[PDB]
Amino acid sequence: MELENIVANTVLLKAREKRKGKSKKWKEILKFPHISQCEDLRRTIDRDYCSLCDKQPIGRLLFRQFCETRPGLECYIQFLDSVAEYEVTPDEKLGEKGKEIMTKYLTPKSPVFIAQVGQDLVSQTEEKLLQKPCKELFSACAQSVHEYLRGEPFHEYLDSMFFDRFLQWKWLERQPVTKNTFRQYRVLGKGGFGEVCACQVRATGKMYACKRLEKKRIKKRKGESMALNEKQILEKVNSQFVVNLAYAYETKDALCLVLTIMNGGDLKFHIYNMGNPGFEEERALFYAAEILCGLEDLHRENTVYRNLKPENILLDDYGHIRISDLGLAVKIPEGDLIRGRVGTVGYMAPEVLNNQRYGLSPDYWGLGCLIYEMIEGQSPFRGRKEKVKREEVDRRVLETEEVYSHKFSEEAKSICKMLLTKDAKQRLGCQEEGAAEVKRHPFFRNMNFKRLEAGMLDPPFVPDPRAVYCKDVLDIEQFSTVKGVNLDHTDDDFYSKFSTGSVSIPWQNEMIETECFKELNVFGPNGTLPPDLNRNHP
Ligand SMILES: NC(=O)c1cn([C@@H]2O[C@H](CO)[C@@H](O)[C@H]2O)c2ncnc(N)c12
Ligand SMILES: [K+]
């Protein structure tokens, strides 16, 4: 054993597990400013109910905490809470759970009666329950509450100390980010214009992955628009099955993307470096399902992926997966095809190999490639450790057909062949339906996709927290030192557009997840103004 490899992992493992890894002076770094400092944000902030009272996590909790100071509003908060529970109760007990809400919030004499719904809607919703139990029964009811809360309660909240406190939180959110903000750990993988390594916010202790983009390498390969495009894409998409962007900042030599940390490792590692090649169909099915949902979300914005291979699918602490490395994705102009000779050897669709125009098709070619590789333990057109000059592997993708073995079930064999059709016109999922045609394939007969997208399905494989499911730090491919490049001011503009600092919603989740919001979000005794919110004197 090499000690660089042992030490690198034990350090990463220690951080991953007092103070939850926070800094000693974290209460000073995240000290609220006096409200008198937040007048600029008070003007800039758009006064939108959905954003300030729901979408933004810390805003959501502060509005709820404000409504809980009034019995006349605490009921509405309890209704929206109960509706959420009803929306995740089993179809078996839906009918029952639907009766408590009605008998507890929707009766003239109920203890927590909410009156702003409408005597017509309560009855309209009352008949719906005798018809059939449905998780979307109270959709109109909960909406009627949002129509009332966004009126007077919202404007009363904007006048209260809780919204002032929100501005204070927003003042910290705006603070600049630098290399100081994080502490870097071992490298987890080579990719793109730099390397991916684990990092940790010093103030909060939350673990992330830092995808480094070396400045000298972007200029030398003219990948500037490609790096920027990756950043925007990661920002626009908000899917449970795609790496989420939390920060994007600049350093003297590189641009950095702070992404969700996936301690479970990539599927390429779980396919080849953990026992026999591939794994059981059960695992492939679950993963194929989540990948489908992740592709479905990327396709809603009409954005192709083109980069689907096992090393770009990752595993989190619980066993779920996310798609990573969106650097090859582009948003499509509606009704047009793109020419791009991009992709990985043995993972490019027949359309891309002929330098031919294509659309959303190459993604479903990749989905089939992954299902096959997970089950068979090898690429559909390349051996496990077989040396082929690119020219032939390419040929095989176009000319030769894949071969299946006893490892494949009838349904697994069927979904693969239907996803691995050379003619993109008659390829599964590439029809006008989109991912709907794929969700119905017999392969997904016991997979309740609606229940998967919610998160009520337990992953089949749970990674052990005290294991690093990755190659050792000294076995990671490295780059060659870039030479002859000098960073000019012409690129200072691109660096500025990229480095936009922290992303609001993820940042707020960081403060909530690490309990920083819990410990710091306090007020005076008896619910009085604390000094940082008192306008008489600091
Ligand atoms: N791009 C990313 O978000 C990530 C890439 N890797 C590793 O880097 C490899 C790709 O170079 C993958 O196979 C993983 O082992 C990651 N490992 C952990 N978390 C992440 N967010 C990533
Ligand atoms: K395996």
From Swiss-Prot:
Changing residue 390 to A: Nuclear exclusion. Highest levels in heart, placenta, lung > skeletal muscle > brain, liver, pancreas > kidney. One of its GO terms (molecular function) is protein kinase C binding. Residues 1-181 are annotated as: N-terminal. It is a peripheral membrane protein. Gene3D superfamilies: 6.10.250.2260, Phosphorylase Kinase, domain 1, Regulator of G-protein Signalling 4, domain 2, Transferase(Phosphotransferase) domain 1. A motif (Nuclear localization signal) lies at residues 384-391. Residues 445-510 form the AGC-kinase C-terminal domain. The modification Phosphoserine is found at residue 480. The modification Phosphothreonine is found at residue 481. It catalyses: [G-protein-coupled receptor] + ATP = [G-protein-coupled receptor]-phosphate + ADP + H(+). Its EC number is 2.7.11.16. Changing residue 387 to A: Nuclear exclusion. Pfam families: Pkinase, RGS. Keywords: Apoptosis, ATP-binding, Cell membrane, Cytoplasm, Kinase, Lipid-binding, Membrane, Nucleotide-binding, Nucleus, Phosphoprotein, Serine/threonine-protein kinase, Transferase, Wnt signaling pathway. Belongs to the protein kinase superfamily. AGC Ser/Thr protein kinase family. GPRK subfamily. Serine/threonine kinase that phosphorylates preferentially the activated forms of a variety of G-protein-coupled receptors (GPCRs). Such receptor phosphorylation initiates beta-arrestin-mediated receptor desensitization, internalization, and signaling events leading to their down-regulation. Phosphorylates a variety of GPCRs, including adrenergic receptors, muscarinic acetylcholine receptors (more specifically Gi-coupled M2/M4 subtypes), dopamine receptors and opioid receptors. This is G protein-coupled receptor kinase 5. It comes from Homo sapiens. The lineage of its organism: Eukaryota, Metazoa, Chordata, Craniata, Vertebrata.
